[PDB]
Design a protein. Structure first.
Ligand SMILES: Nc1ncnc2c1ncn2[C@@H]1O[C@H](COP(=O)(O)OP(=O)(O)OP(=O)(O)O)[C@@H](O)[C@H]1O
Ligand SMILES: Nc1ncnc2c1ncn2[C@@H]1O[C@H](COP(=O)(O)OP(=O)(O)O)[C@@H](O)[C@H]1O
Ligand SMILES: [Mg+2]
Ligand SMILES: [Mg+2]
Lengths: 365, 177, 351, 277, 210, 70, 52, 52, 105, 52
């Protein structure tokens, strides 16, 4: 069953499962903590059960920020109202020794597994950097007297990660929706800790560095983020067809970019220029402001419902918005807001000056 | 009488309202010419500007004192303040005089405009000078061109042009010095 | 294009999330579709070995094999990710021993080792913990013998031994499409065929994402349908031309109206080779659909809806011709003219 | 994974050498075309001072010619004059004028069909293949005079310098259909001229506008060929720039992969020798 | 454990609570990259530890733009909404104008087509880049940064081409009455009674590029 | 010829061979700079064509015939 | 690449060598034909970079 | 020697594909001229009115 | 190179002069210390070098300074191995170089 | 690609200044006079700055 997040690229191209395991693959600064905090903000309140945040090898500043903003959201209630809290925090952050970071994910799983099994209810398990589990085991593993495996890792990487990740499942008695940030070491997805984590996830959201350097946030690679829910027997034929159409347009753009970089756009065919224009449009349209990025961008964040993003991407695919420019799609919520941003961008196209005097900058008033 | 007030300065003021504002106005062939026709002056005395042209050449653009042109009625000479003229040129010899020297340019036909401001614009297709002509192919050319006349009217026209061109060429290559 | 005979090892190699188990799933679902229509002797009993996956992943597969009914002929050996490394390293041999019962008793097996790449990572774990010295990338020296010992057990036995067969489908995952990895180049040199699936073909809409240029079948056309031995020989020839004229027209230089006809028909065939997810086609509605494409009968049909055009070709052509094609195994001229006589009485979209 | 990057370095390097060759051959062909262009500009001037320059005439039939290129590595030349072609077809049209759209060059029928599919009627191509001559422009003008319009519009790129190409609209009026009507201002401006032809002034204007169309067409497709060469000279210069950028990034990437290859292949050897020692 | 080496070091740079004294420790780790590769191992290790980055590009450094701050890539979100309010007023439109300048410079890989609407922001951005660069060992107080960027993102600087904007910024700092710096420092932000005298005092300075 | 070198160089050459190799290696160096541009033959350049033809004159000179040392 | 062009046997005509390809062993008629075939194929190998 | 000198420049290039001798190339070129000149026969027979 | 640095360090310390040192091919110093570390049984670091690459280089290059007596100045020839300026031997060497003099053909 | 006299009047001034700058960077060396003949010229710093 689908889990609607309010993120356009996630709900369109790699939709999350309601009891699924979700991996956010990231490359040191591409935005998986902002994305996992937006998933907390968007999902964790609409979801009625309990929530567990396990911080494994991350910043202690981020743990303090999460604690102080879960208090003033009422998700954590201090004092005598503690029983009405919805979230428990387990923290093994990056100042801890490698033995504490290699076991704190298991403490988070135990807290979530009691709620799943004994209490019998639906849990959200947010694990920020499940990579640090693997990295801490490879730190302590050289001193256990083992022959090291590939790149520098423990020989027992896959079974350690498997024994941890096979416990974060839904059962007949309960449900754990698991969102895990997965750091990738040197922007290398063939590193064995991301490459081993990829098998354990129902929905991988792969975040790119080159997408984030185009300003497109969330920096989700639309042709590398998959899901088991992109299936026409699950999400409907219209959603499946608009997702596959968006992916085909973006793949044809990626196939064209090597000759676009050298020969320019002047050597394209006209259906190829239509492909490039629609692909730049949907590249900008997968971008979205976040309600947790509104504190450092100024733009307020937009939750986008699933039917709205389906209809918007279907309209850009059919051709209904070929008149609008590229930058009207950038960082807007709906397909209405690209029209109002073209209305705002267009109106200014004349408004540039004539603010000479009749100011508030006088000397007596 | 002039019910379409056309022109470049009207096209540039009407073109701003029917085109996108990003495109600048297209250029026109009036902006790449300098000497006009109706405008005052441009003669100053005994010389006058003679623009002897060709599609593939500019043979002269200096000033001459008299220009003999091979008009269809006959050879006329253009002096300084000549009457405005649109003369169609027969195959013949233009001679551009600039004193004692005379360049004998045999043209193959064309036009020659004398404008009101005294500018002579000879406009021919091929203009060979007389030294680079052979007198050998012109005689068998006239003999053969006075022979083949079918019932085609097109070849009658082409053969009449042939015999008048080669006959004027022999008239202007056997009468030289 | 990549035909598979009974007794052949065919590798399904590809990148991360391509159609690798989907080809393997459809081959098992299709055997249930064939076992109900053939006699008792030529029935194929499948084995799916699921090495190093989730339990959630294989619980979706037993749910799928019970829903279609393919679980009646299917063993499901599953050493999952939480299992001990000597259970994942042993599970293909355990599964191959179950499949070899059918090979050794005159019947026909089909084993699918999903992720032999994960069976080598579990074998590297045991070897490096038994202090055996590492080699390439960390693997033991014996890792070619790990898979060649297993894949040589898929055979086609003689009639003195029953005539049973075992068809293997090893699955190997590459990293960035880099087929020059260590375990990937071991199995490419073991198996007879190769089914390379690409991610950039997967996102262009081509599903199954089969790279036609790199996908080999060393048994050739000698072990395929004779009805498609004659209509798909030109299909792999017309697609070889289409690959070349689409590399040059990617620039946008020129078209020649005889080069563009190659680029026209090749785009019909790549839309013709598409297939959706959990619905295999028998053999004879395939070769009719390749007959409709390699004979020009789907020209003047727009390239966007040849996927939608061939539901009409299978629906409107009567099912009497599929029985003659299956029972003969070959388009006789008594059928070949009568096929194209009915391939004009069809309502294609657009027209 | 280090032979794909090496063959990509080889690919981008030979693309850059191909493109620098194309740039230097376009720079050479621009200079040999500048011999012919500046000589042909002379004959345009007597007809533009005799008949004037009247682009916005109220003709009820026009034949518009967009002078495009054959080869396509120009870098936005044919697209620029297709924009100018429709921005003059949306300007000079006044009342429901029949406009015949013609293209000179293969890159015109690829785009004027995309703009004006129904009014497009003729496609001249292969014209710069050997050279451009006046008999060739005369035959093209004869094929335009097979239609009988009241006006002609020629859309071409005026080669000004090696970097400046301005699009130009050059108008030729039909002789007494519209040209004499546009010259009379309470009397005439053409009746100043003593006509020295055999037959009437209608016949001398009928000959003179055919000659004006042939001259305008010859100069137009000389100017556009020179701007074609000088625009390929700048398009194959930016493409060598971007193929040097891509090559520098690929060489940095290849050296990173080379270093990483030596490190991991050495770490494998140490890890295999430390298990035995 | 080379990640742990830097992580356990940099995690000691905290802002303590009120019951621990309220003390703080700011860290500035320096990482040298090779040929601009920020996707290296130790670089991406420390990017995963620190709260932001200050990228210094060698292409901007070789062109004389010093400090060679890669404005698009450098980030400090924790220091945002913790900065000077007077500078936070002016720096928002500074950031948007520099974003537009970077994208209209990426729009022009070539000098052949001028737009005269992007040419405005292409000259305002080269104004702001010349405004931003400063010379070594002379740090500037925050009010004299605020007043200079106020004089740059608004008008008061459009007459100097690109060249004399350093001299113009020095003339802005020297010729404007030094009481307005005291008001900006003690009030912290720009009040309406303050940007009144900002628009007043900036028009009576004499800019050397005329 | 571009990658081959001799760090003794001109000090240990046959004099007289020294008198022709100084322009032979320069002319071959220019031909290597205009190399791979001789695929444009009708697309002439009239100044690089002389060095292209002379470089092709010189590279076909240096070829030899296998245990026939000169 | 020669197998993927449909040419079988997919022998690389340039990269294949023999010690019997000497003119004093197989004659000059065989040797000059083989060297000319390889020369034309290497010319097309250099020209395929600029044709494509 | 023949295909290298220009003796067989007048044959199609697919006449050389998968044939043994140059005699086979000459027999294949004219067999292709022969088959492609026999492609217009399915126009009015065995669509209907067939002789069982 | 340590022997040449001692000969220069006498002139710096005892004679009080401004000495030049010409370490010809500092890359060969790096290469030889790499071979010495390999023969002593040490595990090589990045690309192939000694683990002590920065320390064996800084042991040499930190004795070439200006003292209150005199100075030593080094004109060290630099080799770049794969024409790769990010290789650890020239990247570690360039951290000490105060100037580069490129001689070109 | 354009010609040495294609340039503007200011860029030819920079060409004539840089061509005589890069001549002035050369210098005869005192140790080279045993095989070059021309004596070597030590240049002081103030002379270099003033002349350049
Ligand atoms: N023929 C097809 N048509 C449409 N969708 C397909 C097809 N084949 C696979 N898919 C989709 O692609 C996704 C990947 O398929 P599959 O499960 O075969 O991947 P895989 O190669 O096994 O990847 P992994 O090894 O990571 O599990 C699935 O979600 C499936 O829904
Ligand atoms: N959705 C987003 N919107 C705007 N900026 C973002 C977004 N995601 C990330 N960023 C930028 O990227 C930086 C890194 O974010 P973070 O989630 O901490 O990365 P990571 O956890 O991958 O290291 C943030 O400081 C922010 O500036
Ligand atoms: Mg993080
Ligand atoms: Mg699978």
């Amino acid at each position: 069953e689908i889990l609607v997040t309010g993120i356009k690229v996630v709900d369109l191209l790699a939709p999350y499962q309601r009891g699924g395991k979700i991996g956010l693959f990231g490359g040191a600064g591409v935005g998986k903590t902002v994305l996992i905090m937006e998933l907390i903000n968007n999902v964790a309140k609409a979801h009625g059960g309990f929530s567990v945040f396990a911080g494994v090898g991350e910043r202690t500043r981020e743990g303090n920020d999460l604690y102080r903003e879960m208090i003033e959201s009422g998700v954590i209630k201090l004092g005598a109202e503690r029983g009405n809290s919805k979230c428990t925090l387990v923290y093994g952050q990056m100042n801890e020794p490698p033995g504490a970071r290699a076991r704190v994910a298991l403490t988070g799983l135990t807290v979530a597994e009691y709620f799943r099994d004994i209490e019998g209810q639906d849990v959200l398990l947010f694990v920020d950097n499940i990579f640090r589990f693997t990295q801490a085991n490879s730190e302590v593993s050289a001193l256990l007297g083992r022959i090291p495996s590939a790149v520098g890792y423990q020989p027992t990487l896959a079974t350690d990660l498997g024994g941890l990740q096979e416990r974060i499942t839904t059962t007949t008695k309960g449900s754990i929706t698991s969102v895990q940030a997965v750091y990738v070491p040197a922007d290398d997805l063939t590193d064995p800790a991301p490459a081993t984590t990829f098998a354990h996830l129902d929905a991988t959201t792969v975040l790119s560095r080159s997408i984030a350097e185009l300003g497109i946030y969330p920096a989700v690679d639309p042709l590398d983020s998959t899901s088991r829910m992109l299936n026409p027997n699950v999400i409907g034929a219209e959603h499946y067809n608009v997702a596959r159409g968006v992916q085909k347009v973006l793949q044809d753009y990626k196939n064209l970019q090597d000759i676009i970089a050298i020969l320019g756009m002047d050597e394209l065919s006209e259906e190829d220029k239509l492909t490039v224009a629609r692909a730049r449009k949907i590249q900008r349209f997968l971008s979205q402001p976040f309600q947790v990025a509104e504190v450092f961008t100024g733009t307020p964040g937009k939750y986008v419902d699933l039917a709205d993003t389906i209809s918007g991407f279907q309209g850009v695919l059919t051709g209904k918005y070929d008149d609008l420019p590229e930058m009207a799609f950038y960082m807007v919520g709906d397909i209405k807001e690209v029209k109002e941003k073209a209305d705002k961008m267009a109106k200014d196209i004349a408004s540039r000056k004539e603010a000479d005097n009749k100011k508030v900058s006088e000397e007596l008033k | 009488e002039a019910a379409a007030p056309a022109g470049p300065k009207e096209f540039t003021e009407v073109w701003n309202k029917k085109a996108p504002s990003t495109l600048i106005v297209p250029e026109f062939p009036s902006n790449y010419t300098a000497v006009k026709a109706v405008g005052e002056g441009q003669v100053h005395g005994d010389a006058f500007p003679v623009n002897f042209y060709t599609p593939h050449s500019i043979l002269s653009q200096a000033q001459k004192d008299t220009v003999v042109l091979p008009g269809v009625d006959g050879y006329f000479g253009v002096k300084a303040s000549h009457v405005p003229t649109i003369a169609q040129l027969k195959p013949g010899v233009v001679e551009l005089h600039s004193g004692a020297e005379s360049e004998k340019f045999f043209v193959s036909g064309g036009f020659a405009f004398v404008h009101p401001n005294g500018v002579t614009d000879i406009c021919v297709l091929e203009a060979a000078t007389l030294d680079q002509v052979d007198p050998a192919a012109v005689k068998s050319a006239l003999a053969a061109a006075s022979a083949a006349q079918p019932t085609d009217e097109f070849e009658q026209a082409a053969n009449r042009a042939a015999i008048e061109l080669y006959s004027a060429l022999e008239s202007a290559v056997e009468a030289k010095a | 294009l990549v035909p598979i005979g009974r007794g052949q090892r065919e590798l399904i190699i590809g990148d991360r999330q391509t159609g690798k188990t989907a080809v393997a799933i459809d081959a098992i679902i299709h055997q249930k579709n064939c076992n109900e229509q053939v006699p008792k002797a030529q029935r194929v009993y499948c084995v799916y070995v699921a090495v190093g996956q989730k339990r959630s992943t294989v619980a979706q597969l037993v749910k799928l094999f019970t829903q279609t009914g393919a679980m009646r002929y299917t063993i499901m050996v599953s050493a999952t990710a939480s299992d001990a490394a000597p259970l994942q390293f042993l599970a293909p041999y355990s599964g191959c021993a179950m499949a070899e019962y059918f090979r050794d008793t005159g019947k026909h097996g089909l084993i699918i080792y999903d992720d032999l790449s994960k069976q080598s990572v579990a074998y590297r774990q045991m070897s490096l913990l038994l202090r055996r010295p590492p080699g390439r990338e960390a693997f033991p020296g014996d890792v070619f013998y790990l898979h060649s010992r297993l894949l040589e057990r898929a055979a086609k036995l003689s009639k003195e031994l029953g005539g049973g067969s075992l068809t293997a489908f090893p699955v190997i995952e590459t990293q960035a499409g880099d087929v020059s990895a260590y375990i990937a180049t071991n199995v490419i040199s073991i198996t007879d065929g190769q089914i390379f699936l690409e991610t950039e073909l997967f996102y262009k809409g081509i599903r199954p994402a089969l790279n036609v240029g790199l996908s080999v079948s060393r048994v050739g056309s000698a072990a395929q349908f004779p009805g498609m031995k004659q209509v798909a020989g030109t299909l792999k020839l017309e697609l070889a031309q289409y690959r070349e004229v689409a590399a040059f027209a990617q620039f946008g230089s020129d078209l020649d109206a005889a080069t563009q006809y190659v680029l026209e028909r090749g785009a019909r065939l790549t839309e013709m080779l598409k297939q959706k997810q959990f619905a295999p086609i028998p053999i004879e509605r395939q070769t009719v659909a390749v007959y409709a494409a390699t004979k020009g009968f789907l020209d003047k049909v727009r390239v966007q809806d040849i996927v939608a055009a061939e539901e009409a070709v299978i629906s409107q052509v009567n099912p009497a011709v599929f029985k003659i094609l299956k029972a003969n195994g070959k388009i006789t001229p008594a059928l070949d003219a009568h096929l194209k006589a009915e391939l004009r009485k069809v309502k294609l979209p657009g027209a | 994974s280090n032979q794909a990057v090496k063959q990509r370095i080889r690919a981008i390097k030979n693309i850059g050498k191909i493109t620098k060759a194309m740039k230097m051959v376009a720079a050479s062909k621009m200079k040999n075309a500048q011999i012919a262009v500046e000589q042909s500009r002379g004959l345009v001037d007597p007809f533009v001072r005799l008949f004037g320059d009247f682009p916005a005439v109220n003709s009820n039939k026009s034949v518009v010619v967009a002078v495009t290129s054959d080869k396509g590595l120009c870098g936005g030349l044919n697209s620029n004059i297709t924009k100018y072609t429709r921005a003059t077809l949306a300007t000079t049209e006044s009342e429901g004028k029949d406009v015949v759209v013609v293209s000179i060059g293969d890159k015109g029928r690829s785009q004027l069909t995309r703009i004006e599919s129904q009014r497009y009627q003729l496609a001249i191509a292969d014209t710069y293949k050997v050279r451009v001559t006046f008999g060739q422009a005369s035959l093209i003008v004869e094929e335009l005079i097979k239609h009988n319009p009241q006006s002609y519009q020629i859309l071409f790129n005026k080669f000004r310098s090696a970097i400046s190409f301005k699009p130009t609209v050059a108008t030729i009026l039909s002789p007494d259909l519209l040209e004499k009507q546009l010259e009379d201002v309470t009397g005439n401006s053409l009746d100043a001229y003593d006509i020295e032809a055999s037959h009437e002034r209608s016949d001398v204007l009928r000959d003179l506008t055919e000659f004006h169309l042939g001259v305008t067409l010859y100069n137009a497709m000389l100017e556009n060929n020179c701007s074609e060469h000088a625009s390929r000279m700048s398009a194959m210069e930016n493409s060598t720039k971007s193929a040097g950028e891509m090559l520098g990034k690929l060489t940095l990437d290849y050296n990173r992969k080379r270093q990483a290859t030596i490190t991991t292949e050495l770490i494998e050897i140490i890890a295999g020798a430390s298990a035995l020692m």
